[PDB]
């Protein structure tokens with residue numbers, strides 16, 4: 001059992017349609033390598049104390065959330081933190097309901113104004129019972145904003161997040177630093193003020209969609225450029241689309257850089 | 271390869287949180303029997319011609335839709351038909367996008383007014399590009415209503431659906447007859463006018479949630495009562511929650527009645 005650590009699990013490392021796409025398209029990925037089967041992008045963040053008690057926080061609840069949590073072996077949850085309101089990051093939100101019953105209290109969720117306002121539109125019944133329904137709400141909303149740290153409490157002690165702004169095509173997404181681990185998905189550019197949060201990470205988890213440019217995400221080359229500038233000790237690529245084959249990308253990248261895979265898990269000192 | 275037939279695949283046969291729940295709760299289900307692992311409720315409907323060309327229609331696109339379609343081995347889709355606007359039946363809707371690209375045209379979806387109006391609220395971006403976005407819409411909406419048959423065209427020939435009203439707790443859901451196969455999920459009572467569509471089926475797929483009463487679904491006993499009255503040649507139970515173990519329910523039910531399982535597949539004459 002883990003003790004005296006943060007533990008991170010890469011729940012999903014795929015692009016918005018997953019790998020393979022729903023039509024069975026693997027792109028250039030080797031279908032025989034299980035590491036190329038990719039769920040939608042999400043990160044589990046845990047803190048364990050000396051006795052193995054844990055605080056558990058998920059970053060994003062996409063459509064794969066339920067299977068991600070089942071397969072993680074972690075059976076409790078303290079909070080959900082959201083990057084931005086795109087389908088692949090939010091459409092598994094209803095599956096928070098079981099934990100509300102287990103915990104006997106609303107699930108604390110964390111989101112910026114843009115994300116929160118879209119969740120209210122799309123998933124109002126999670127916040128407020130609509131006319132003609134008997135379903136109680138399940139979520140308790142908390143604001144977050146770039147450059148304002150926030151902490152989530154739980155049985156393993158507090159987990160402190162440092163959110164920051166990312167450009168994501170035509171909208172803003174959030175990245176987060178947790179200790180010396182940084183999570184940057186759905187990003188096409190980093191604003192100058194965000195650099196302090198992303199440099200000198202022990203582990204930088206950074207989105208690299210594909211080889212060719214895309215308006216909303218870094219290409220592999222752009223991600224590598226950023227990794228060279230930010231000098232993380234280790235980098236892990238995420239939000240990888242069907243052009244990016246695990247073995248191939250492993251070869252093409254520096255030794256301290258690797259494509260992620262679903263279930264990739266590591267512990268770090270608190 | 272299939273020929274000259276309708277083919278039905280039970281894509282999912284679970285209750286709204288799946289089996290096991292996200293917290294790893296299997297209830298009374300034997301976790302060692304793969305048939306007890308249940309995705310959210312959905313049915314694939316295909317028509318094959320003499321040369322093996324197919325028309326493909328899905329009933330409901332819940333969170334498991336992508337994996338359901340991948341695992342089905344069927345890599346194309348002509349339409350989606352919706353029963354009612356509950357999370358477990360609609361929150362995988364974004365994953366229709368790949369087929370829109372493949373088909374070069376909007377995905378035809380079919381829904382009653384209640385369902386359509388909720389989809390417009392929750393998933394507006396699928397119908398109409400919102401302010402500040404460049405994402406084109408992906409869906410083309412068609413009305414359906416109880417007692418009004420409708421047909422979907424495709425490469426395998428037309429598939430004719432006969433929709434009818436079901437009581438589902440505080441709302442209405444739709445059931446459908448396709449030839450002599452009937453699909454009745456999320457139903458707590460059948461209105462008198464719907465009986466003509468449900469009697470004398472070759473195969474009746476009918477929701478049975480659990481043993482104890484529930485306001486929104488038939489219990490196993492209630493489902494069996496209905497099966498005795500409607501005299502289907504074969505019945506398959508669906509939308510089964512964690513109290514209902516496959517082997518156990520198999521024993522407890524008449525020979526012509528069985529609990530479903532994900533991937534359950536059969537062909538019938540056109």
Ligand SMILES: Nc1nc2c(ncn2[C@@H]2O[C@H](COP(=O)(O)O)[C@@H](O)[C@H]2O)c(=O)[nH]1
Pocket residue numbers: 015016017085086087088090186216364367395400403405
């Ligand atoms: N919930 C939501 N999803 C959107 C919206 N516009 C696009 N999407 C979906 O969000 C995803 C964008 O994927 P990305 O390439 O940023 O990972 C796709 O699944 C796309 O269909 C929107 O306005 N709301």
Ligand SMILES: Nc1nc2c(ncn2[C@@H]2O[C@H](COP(=O)(O)O)[C@@H](O)[C@H]2O)c(=O)[nH]1
Pocket residue numbers: 094097125130133135285286287355356357358360456486
């Ligand atoms: N999309 C949507 N889902 C709902 C609403 N109210 C309840 N739900 C969800 O719909 C499901 C109801 O499940 P049922 O027991 O009918 O299979 C649960 O996942 C529940 O959280 C609603 O107003 N809209």
Ligand SMILES: [K+]
Pocket residue numbers: 249250251252253254255256257258
């Ligand atoms: K490498």
Ligand SMILES: [K+]
Pocket residue numbers: 519520521522523524525526527528
């Ligand atoms: K039986």
Ligand SMILES: [Mn+2]
Pocket residue numbers: 015016041086088089186239
């Ligand atoms: Mn994304």
Ligand SMILES: [Mn+2]
Pocket residue numbers: 084086168186
């Ligand atoms: Mn995005």
Ligand SMILES: [Mn+2]
Pocket residue numbers: 285286311356358359456509
């Ligand atoms: Mn349901």
Ligand SMILES: [Mn+2]
Pocket residue numbers: 354356438456
């Ligand atoms: Mn329902």
